[PDB]
């Protein structure tokens, strides 16, 4: 394992889908809030939807 900061791992991950990595850094709080909220929807989905 090689450590790397998570916002730099996401720049590799964006560049791997052809989205240029400055599109992460210029939107990092939006991308974080969308991810955190999407994990939230999985808790509610799994809690409700037997």
């Amino acid at each position: 394992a090689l450590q790397i900061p998570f916002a730099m791992q996401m720049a590799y991950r964006f560049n791997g889908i052809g989205v240029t990595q400055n599109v992460l850094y210029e939107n990092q709080k939006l991308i974080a809030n969308q991810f955190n909220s999407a994990i939230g929807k999985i808790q509610d989905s799994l809690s409700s939807t037997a």
């Binding site: 900061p5 916002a7 400055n22 850094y25």
Partner: peptide, 12 residues
């Protein structure tokens, strides 16, 4: 390297 935007937008 490539430019985009300015210093105020980027964390770290």
């Amino acid at each position: 390297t490539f430019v985009s935007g300015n210093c105020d937008v980027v964390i770290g």
